[PDB]
Design an enzyme around this catalytic site. Structure first.
Site, PDB file in Angstrom:
ATOM      1  N   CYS A  58       3.801   1.261   9.491  1.00 21.92           N
ATOM      2  CA  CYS A  58       3.637   0.213   8.456  1.00 21.92           C
ATOM      3  C   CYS A  58       4.999  -0.247   7.946  1.00 21.92           C
ATOM      4  CB  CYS A  58       2.775   0.683   7.298  1.00 21.92           C
ATOM      5  SG  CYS A  58       1.060   0.672   7.820  1.00 21.92           S
TER       6      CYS A  58
ATOM      7  N   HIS B 121       0.850  -1.227   0.000  1.00 19.64           N
ATOM      8  CA  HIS B 121       0.000   0.000   0.000  1.00 19.64           C
ATOM      9  C   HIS B 121       0.873   1.260   0.000  1.00 19.64           C
ATOM     10  CE1 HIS B 121      -0.316  -0.657   4.528  1.00 19.64           C
ATOM     11  NE2 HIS B 121       0.006   0.643   4.481  1.00 19.64           N
TER      12      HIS B 121
ATOM     13  N   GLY C  14       2.888   5.830  10.009  1.00 22.07           N
ATOM     14  CA  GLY C  14       4.323   5.739   9.708  1.00 22.07           C
ATOM     15  C   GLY C  14       4.933   4.420  10.165  1.00 22.07           C
TER      16      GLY C  14
HETATM   17  C1  LIG Z   1       0.393   2.253   7.623  1.00 27.79           C
HETATM   18  O1  LIG Z   1       0.007   2.504   6.269  1.00 27.79           O
HETATM   19  C2  LIG Z   1       1.408   3.312   7.994  1.00 27.79           C
HETATM   20  N1  LIG Z   1       1.768   4.252   6.943  1.00 27.79           N
HETATM   21  O2  LIG Z   1       1.892   3.357   9.083  1.00 27.79           O
HETATM   22  C3  LIG Z   1      -0.843   2.355   8.513  1.00 27.79           C
HETATM   23  C4  LIG Z   1      -0.648   1.973   9.985  1.00 27.79           C
HETATM   24  C5  LIG Z   1      -1.875   2.300  10.820  1.00 27.79           C
HETATM   25  C6  LIG Z   1      -2.074   3.787  11.111  1.00 27.79           C
HETATM   26  C7  LIG Z   1      -2.499   3.868  12.572  1.00 27.79           C
HETATM   27  N2  LIG Z   1      -2.142   2.565  13.112  1.00 27.79           N
HETATM   28  C8  LIG Z   1      -1.869   1.645  12.188  1.00 27.79           C
HETATM   29  O3  LIG Z   1      -1.687   0.442  12.417  1.00 27.79           O
HETATM   30  N3  LIG Z   1      -1.883   1.510   7.906  1.00 27.79           N
HETATM   31  C9  LIG Z   1      -3.001   1.996   7.370  1.00 27.79           C
HETATM   32  O4  LIG Z   1      -3.301   3.192   7.396  1.00 27.79           O
HETATM   33  C10 LIG Z   1      -3.929   0.964   6.738  1.00 27.79           C
HETATM   34  C11 LIG Z   1      -3.904   1.042   5.226  1.00 27.79           C
HETATM   35  C12 LIG Z   1      -5.293   1.442   4.747  1.00 27.79           C
HETATM   36  C13 LIG Z   1      -6.148   1.718   5.967  1.00 27.79           C
HETATM   37  N4  LIG Z   1      -5.307   1.293   7.091  1.00 27.79           N
HETATM   38  C14 LIG Z   1      -5.696   1.245   8.380  1.00 27.79           C
HETATM   39  O5  LIG Z   1      -4.968   0.878   9.291  1.00 27.79           O
HETATM   40  O6  LIG Z   1      -6.969   1.661   8.505  1.00 27.79           O
HETATM   41  C15 LIG Z   1      -7.339   2.234   9.791  1.00 27.79           C
HETATM   42  C16 LIG Z   1      -6.548   3.474  10.079  1.00 27.79           C
HETATM   43  C17 LIG Z   1      -6.379   3.901  11.389  1.00 27.79           C
HETATM   44  C18 LIG Z   1      -5.657   5.057  11.663  1.00 27.79           C
HETATM   45  C19 LIG Z   1      -5.085   5.785  10.636  1.00 27.79           C
HETATM   46  C20 LIG Z   1      -5.252   5.367   9.328  1.00 27.79           C
HETATM   47  C21 LIG Z   1      -5.997   4.227   9.051  1.00 27.79           C
HETATM   48  C22 LIG Z   1      -4.756   0.072   4.446  1.00 27.79           C
HETATM   49  C23 LIG Z   1      -5.482  -1.107   5.073  1.00 27.79           C
HETATM   50  C24 LIG Z   1      -4.235  -0.220   3.052  1.00 27.79           C
END
Ligand SMILES: *[C@](O)(C(N)=O)[C@H](C[C@@H]1CCNC1=O)NC(=O)[C@@H]1[C@@H]2[C@H](CN1C(=O)OCc1ccccc1)C2(C)C
Ligand SMILES: *[C@](O)(C(N)=O)[C@H](C[C@@H]1CCNC1=O)NC(=O)[C@@H]1[C@@H]2[C@H](CN1C(=O)OCc1ccccc1)C2(C)C
Lengths: 301, 301
Positions: free
Chosen positions: A145, A41, A143
């Site tokens: 991920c 992603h 951040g």
């Molecule tokens: C990840 O992309 C990152 N850049 O760190 C992130 C980690 C999340 C953010 C807050 N805690 C975590 O575990 N993952 C995501 O944003 C994933 C990604 C979309 C939606 N999503 C997700 O976790 O959805 C819920 C969410 C919560 C808080 C902030 C943003 C999203 C996919 C599943 C592809």
């Protein structure tokens, strides 16, 4: 003496963490030999993430769209492929800090250390258990991920987890290093439910052994039981059934304390039926199920 | 989201750990520049440890009596001095993995990461708080002596603790890296008592802010209080008095949640007087006091 939730030393994994940027999305990657592994992603805009077509997005990317940084050194991407929910980025430099490593798929009930990282930079290390419902109870901000989970066997790093997402309940979901999710989850920002979770019985018994070793022995009773009688009581409290495999795995702790596993099961049956009657075990008013038998043997001898 | 007890990444400290043997006593040392720091009881036999004269034992040692190993490399000792309860061993090679570092003396209530090591080899990493009574609640077996406690400020390792001993209650006692004990303890195998411990109030408030951030808000009441009224209630429960300095330190968390510190104090006053009435906070049935305000800001933003 003493018992603490303890992570593996993170040094061998710190040397593998890099920052991966595609367009304006930044997250962490794992640099092993000449390959960088990160969540796929990284190629999505915020819009895409609601319902992404990863194959279509990756088609339109070039090697040049991927900015990979290890400290103040840019790594040139010379190739890229998708494996399930993980991007592999071939880079022009093998990581000279690559440890002895393996990719493993862990089972529910097993623990691993999480190296939480932001912008390719390690922030903190803590232990998680893979829940029966294939979620983990972690601490992850935006951040994080691409942060990974691992065990160490002397000099060998077994990578078992890469972080992708937070479910609506605030538990965490991720893949193995082959990009296969743990649990029935997909990398899309739409509402997803985990199964009802269950209590990892074998880990509660491990923790009761740790409590005995640390002098907390008030819950020990003169009774034994049978595996069958134990499982008929424990299932009402949403405990996983205890198998002979679990009993076999608790053998070392039974040997260290001279307390038979089915003796301990009789103590746990009473705790489940009667509660803790205002007493604690290793300081806790609740039963702990995220310590494995190995976690207890390792730390308590 | 999510909240976990998290250690600093241990890599910069792993590169400093060595094995120190004198006669048949082995423990860990910390190799920084051309100096190895270890507990001075490395020079004792089991007999000596009951009532040692360290100056007399060190007199009769030579440089050659000290076997210092970093992996399969022996380091030659070319000098040795005692600083309080720590041996300094000058060695012929500076450690090329020496990070930016400082020696700090931490205050009661502050946290640090412990890198538990055996035979110079890192085993695990976990967070401890320096108790008001100058003990720590750790996990240490025989061979862990010389393991250190540290904080990281970006690239700088602040070393604050070296492990020496286990008190009869099973809590742990150690020195700063100048070899001064925390608390009224001495490095002799004779029975020693810590002061009565107290609850670190400022850390309980920090943890209640973490609970609010994570959606646990059932304990929040419509009331405020005064610092004075709060401290008159909290002292009966063996809580440290809350100072204006503590209130000032909680400012960032008050700002993040829009909940005034004295509003939170009113919620804590009710929890102390009424108990948790069969409810949990961040999964726990007890109030947690080993998370600092910094631990909470760091992890929760
Ligand atoms: C990840 O992309 C990152 N850049 O760190 C992130 C980690 C999340 C953010 C807050 N805690 C975590 O575990 N993952 C995501 O944003 C994933 C990604 C979309 C939606 N999503 C997700 O976790 O959805 C819920 C969410 C919560 C808080 C902030 C943003 C999203 C996919 C599943 C592809
Ligand atoms: C340390 O020397 C080592 N080699 O690891 C050891 C660490 C202890 C062992 C078990 N947990 C620990 O924290 N420290 C000691 O043995 C010190 C040393 C004597 C006595 N002592 C100590 O901790 O006394 C209690 C004890 C408990 C278990 C085993 C041995 C001793 C001094 C104080 C100099």
């Amino acid at each position: 003496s003493g018992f603490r939730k303890m992570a593996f030393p993170s040094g061998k994994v710190e040397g593998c963490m890099v920052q991966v940027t595609c367009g304006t999305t930044t997250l962490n990657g794992l640099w092993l030999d000449d390959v960088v592994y990160c969540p796929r992603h990284v190629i999505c805009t915020s819009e895409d993430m609601l319902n992404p077509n990863y194959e279509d997005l990756l088609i339109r990317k070039s090697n040049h769209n991927f900015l990979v940084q290890a400290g103040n050194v840019q790594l040139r991407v010379i190739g890229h492929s998708m494996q399930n929910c993980v991007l592999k980025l071939k880079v022009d430099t093998a990581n000279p800090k690559t440890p002895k490593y393996k990719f493993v798929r862990i089972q529910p009930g097993q623990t691993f250390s999480v190296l939480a990282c932001y912008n390719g930079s390690p922030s903190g290390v803590y232990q998680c258990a893979m829940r029966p419902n294939f979620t983990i109870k972690g601490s992850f901000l935006n951040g994080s991920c691409g942060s990974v989970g691992f065990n160490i066997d002397y000099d060998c790093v077994s990578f078992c987890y890469m972080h992708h997402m937070e479910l609506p309940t605030g538990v965490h979901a991720g893949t193995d290093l082959e990009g296969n999710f743990y649990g029935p989850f997909v990398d899309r920002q739409t509402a997803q439910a985990a199964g009802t979770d269950t209590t990892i019985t074998v880990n509660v018994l491990a923790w009761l052994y740790a409590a005995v070793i640390n002098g907390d022995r008030w819950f020990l009773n003169r009774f034994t039981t049978t595996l069958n009688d134990f499982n008929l009581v424990a299932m009402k409290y949403n405990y996983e059934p205890l198998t002979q495999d679990h009993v076999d795995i608790l053998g070392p702790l039974s040997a260290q304390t001279g307390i038979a596993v089915l003796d301990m099961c009789a103590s746990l049956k009473e705790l489940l039926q009667n509660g803790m009657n205002g007493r604690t075990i290793l300081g806790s008013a609740l039963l702990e199920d995220e310590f494995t038998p190995f976690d207890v043997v390792r730390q308590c001898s």
